[PDB]
Amino acid sequence: QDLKTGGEQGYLRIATEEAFATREIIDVYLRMIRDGTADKGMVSLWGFYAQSPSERATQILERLLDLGERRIADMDATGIDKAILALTSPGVQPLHDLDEARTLATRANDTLADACQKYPDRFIGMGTVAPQDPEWSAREIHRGARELGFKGIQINSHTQGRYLDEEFFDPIFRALVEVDQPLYIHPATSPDSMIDPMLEAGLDGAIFGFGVETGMHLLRLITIGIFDKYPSLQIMVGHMGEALPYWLYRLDYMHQAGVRSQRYERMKPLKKTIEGYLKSNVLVTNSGVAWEPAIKFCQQVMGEDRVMYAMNYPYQYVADEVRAMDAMDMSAQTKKKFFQTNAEKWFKL
Amino acid sequence: QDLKTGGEQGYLRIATEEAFATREIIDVYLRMIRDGTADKGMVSLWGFYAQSPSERATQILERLLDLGERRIADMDATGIDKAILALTSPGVQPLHDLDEARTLATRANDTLADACQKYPDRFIGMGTVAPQDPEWSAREIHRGARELGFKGIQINSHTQGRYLDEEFFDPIFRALVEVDQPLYIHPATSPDSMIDPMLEAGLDGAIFGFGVETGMHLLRLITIGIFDKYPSLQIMVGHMGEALPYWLYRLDYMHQAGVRSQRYERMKPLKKTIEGYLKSNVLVTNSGVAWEPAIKFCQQVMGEDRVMYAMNYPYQYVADEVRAMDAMDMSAQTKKKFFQTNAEKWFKL
Numbered sequence: 152q153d154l155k156t157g158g159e160q161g162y163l164r165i166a167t168e169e170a171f172a173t174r175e176i177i178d179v180y181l182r183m184i185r186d187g188t189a190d191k192g193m194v195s196l197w198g199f200y201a202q203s204p205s206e207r208a209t210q211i212l213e214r215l216l217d218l219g220e221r222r223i224a225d226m227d228a229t230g231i232d233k234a235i236l237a238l239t240s241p242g243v244q245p246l247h248d249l250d251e252a253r254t255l256a257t258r259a260n261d262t263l264a265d266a267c268q269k270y271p272d273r274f275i276g277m278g279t280v281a282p283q284d285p286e287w288s289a290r291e292i293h294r295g296a297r298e299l300g301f302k303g304i305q306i307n308s309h310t311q312g313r314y315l316d317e318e319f320f321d322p323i324f325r326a327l328v329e330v331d332q333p334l335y336i337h338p339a340t341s342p343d344s345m346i347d348p349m350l351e352a353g354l355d356g357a358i359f360g361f362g363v364e365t366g367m368h369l370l371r372l373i374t375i376g377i378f379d380k381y382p383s384l385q386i387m388v389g390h391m392g393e394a395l396p397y398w399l400y401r402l403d404y405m406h407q408a409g410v411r412s413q414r415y416e417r418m419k420p421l422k423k424t425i426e427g428y429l430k431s432n433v434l435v436t437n438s439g440v441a442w443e444p445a446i447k448f449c450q451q452v453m454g455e456d457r458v459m460y461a462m463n464y465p466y467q468y469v470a471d472e473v474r475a476m477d478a479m480d481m482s483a484q485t486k487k488k489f490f491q492t493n494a495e496k497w498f499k500l
Numbered sequence: 501q502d503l504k505t506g507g508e509q510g511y512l513r514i515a516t517e518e519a520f521a522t523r524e525i526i527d528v529y530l531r532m533i534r535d536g537t538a539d540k541g542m543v544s545l546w547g548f549y550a551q552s553p554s555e556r557a558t559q560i561l562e563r564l565l566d567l568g569e570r571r572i573a574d575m576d577a578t579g580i581d582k583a584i585l586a587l588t589s590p591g592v593q594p595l596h597d598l599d600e601a602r603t604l605a606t607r608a609n610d611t612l613a614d615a616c617q618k619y620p621d622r623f624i625g626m627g628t629v630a631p632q633d634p635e636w637s638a639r640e641i642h643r644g645a646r647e648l649g650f651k652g653i654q655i656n657s658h659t660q661g662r663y664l665d666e667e668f669f670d671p672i673f674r675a676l677v678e679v680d681q682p683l684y685i686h687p688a689t690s691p692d693s694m695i696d697p698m699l700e701a702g703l704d705g706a707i708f709g710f711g712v713e714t715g716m717h718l719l720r721l722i723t724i725g726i727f728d729k730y731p732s733l734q735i736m737v738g739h740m741g742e743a744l745p746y747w748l749y750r751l752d753y754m755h756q757a758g759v760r761s762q763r764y765e766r767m768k769p770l771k772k773t774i775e776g777y778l779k780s781n782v783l784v785t786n787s788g789v790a791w792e793p794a795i796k797f798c799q800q801v802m803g804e805d806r807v808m809y810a811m812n813y814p815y816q817y818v819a820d821e822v823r824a825m826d827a828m829d830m831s832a833q834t835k836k837k838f839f840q841t842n843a844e845k846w847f848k849l
């Protein structure tokens with residue numbers, strides 16, 4: 152009742168990492184699980200959400216699938232004015248049939264664009280792609296920006312164990328720069344090449360493995376020099392920067408030693424320090440981290456203009472979290488950046 | 501201006517994560533690399549330090565091997581009063597011949613004890629074990645405490661792809677509580693089950709993979725309920741807690757979710773929150789992170805009684821890091837805890 156839409160408290164609440172699904176894609180996951188082509192991450196994650204009779208899981212599924220009045224109602228009840236929506240991890244990235252991946256990504260994008268068109272003041276879209284086909288992905292990036300009204304794309308970290316620093320994926324970056332839109336690297340379960348010890352302990356998901364997977368992915372992109380190749384490119388990550396801001400001193404110290412060593416072909420001198428890239432090319436949301444000390448730490452390290460509010464609905468739908476964020480010991484100006492104007496700037500809303 | 505031993509600035513400087521090597525053990529690593537029994541981590545780490553003609557590597561190795569005049573002079577030049585010493589990672593943990601591992605650990609421990617006897621006001625020992633044989637390792641824990649004057653043990657994370665949460669390793673914990681000593685879990689390269697994507701990018705070492713490996717290891721001990729079984733047990737980690745203090749909100753939220761969902765046999769209800777265990781059973785050093793923002797964050801999160809200074813000599817021997825730590829914006833009282841009195845309490849000096 153005290154969480155209201157309309158911005159009377161001094162800012163709109165724009166939630167920047169909100170998830171949806173389509174039934175057909177989840178049915179592909181089920182099919183892959185049943186036929187033994189699903190990787191261990193898919194079995195762990197979607198084997199649970201798509202099959203568990205638990206209320207928590209079935210409510211998550213229903214909320215993911217809705218792009219209408221239920222979602223709006225859930226937003227209204229937590230004072231969320233606008234939601235930036237993307238197809239839930241891992242999207243079509245694990246699909247081995249490329250016609251099927253492109254087809255289902257196309258349709259998910261059309262489905263999302265339709266919903267944003269119906270609720271243009273509430274729903275904002277990020278496109279989904281199929282990095283198995285970087286050239287098609289580039290066309291979908293352009294199509295999203297030009298025809299669909301999307302504000303960027305979300306990539307669900309690795310694609311079948313392959314990372315975006317590979318030259319093979321270059322067309323994707325080229326297109327984002329052409330349309331001048333950000334890439335949100337959202338987590339996925341680790342590939343089978345890494346997941347085993349986390350899986351055994353129940354640590355492969357959002358508790359830990361998500362952060363490992365996504366942190367590595369962003370770090371690999373930084374150290375390969377993606378922001379020297381593409382100085383205008385902005386990469387967004389959630390979960391308070393997957394710990395990279397906390398690791399920053401160690402990252403710069405060890406990166407400098409690594410470059411000087413000249414051991415690694417893929418670790419050569421960069422034009423900025425890692426800290427520099429965090430301040431100029433990387434952007435962070437607090438998805439999953441409704442925790443003031445970590446938010447302030449990141450605002451201090453990266454700059455208050457570069458840290459944004461996200462709810463991570465429907466996985467983490469908690470009124471008391473929005474309340475804790477509303478009540479942060481932060482100036483009105485800083486708080487308005489965090490909830491509203493940073494997102495409006497960086498996503499060009 | 502000089503860095504001086506003696507504590508005239510108001511505290512002694514006690515460095516709590518300092519490494520040494522023995523020639524024979526480095527020689528085993530090389531034999532292992534030559535004959536193809538070394539895992540990819542050992543090839544990456546020691547294949548480099550033990551063979552590279554580069555300055556950083558040659559000096560690291562010379563410094564590791566010295567337990568006398570050079571080490572004392574390096575300490576004196578940086579105003580380090582005492583160093584807590586442990587055999588450098590991975591110690592004898594990778595060795596497949598159990599006789600050889602027990603022999604080399606024994607000899608490493610005796611060598612260390614001899615050095616500590618020779619410089620009793622400068623060197624303090626932590627014992628090395630062979631978790632391949634937990635029952636022997638329990639005996640060696642008792643021996644180090646009873647005969648060698650050691651203050652605890654260092655384990656270099658996994659032992660051949662296995663983690664300490666497995667029931668098999670229980671005698672090690674039983675022994676630590678019997679002698680009432682802390683376990684320092686120091687990093688190692690990830691096992692072959694996890695290392696590939698980090699290895700490709702040059703991120704398997706201290707820049708990132710060390711943090712992934714060690715953070716995962718401590719997290720899996722927390723979630724198996726090691727501190728409910730052994731509530732007196734203290735585990736120390738370096739590198740500002742391997743990001744776990746930064747991740748604390750996410751860990752508690754997602755841990756609660758995992759427990760409630762029953763998805764994981766090895767994630768069952770615990771008596772405290774993860775925050776509770778950080779405040780009562782986990783201890784942190786700033787090894788490799790001479791960076792005031794991270795240090796202060798950690799002090800806030802865990803309590804300033806639970807955060808200690810470490811240099812990580814000789815891997816990170818930097819006079820300006822010591823000066824930066826001396827100059828941090830903290831009360832004199834906090835700074836004395838950080839540099840001296842926390843270590844005195846937790847290692848029982």
Ligand SMILES: COc1cc(C(=O)O)cc([N+](=O)[O-])c1O
Nearest residue numbers: 170239240241356357439463466
């Ligand atoms: C499948 O997508 C997600 C799943 C979960 C989870 O299972 O806890 C978390 C988030 N998240 O961003 O933390 C996700 O978006």
Ligand SMILES: COc1cc(C(=O)O)cc([N+](=O)[O-])c1O
Nearest residue numbers: 519588589687705706788812815
């Ligand atoms: C083999 O021992 C270590 C190696 C490195 C390194 O390669 O820089 C760093 C640390 N450390 O704990 O940060 C070590 O102790």
Ligand SMILES: [Cl-]
Nearest residue numbers: 270271272273
């Ligand atoms: Cl509307």
Ligand SMILES: [Cl-]
Nearest residue numbers: 619620621622
């Ligand atoms: Cl002495």
Ligand SMILES: [Mn+2]
Nearest residue numbers: 168170438463
């Ligand atoms: Mn999410």
Ligand SMILES: [Mn+2]
Nearest residue numbers: 517519787812
């Ligand atoms: Mn170390």
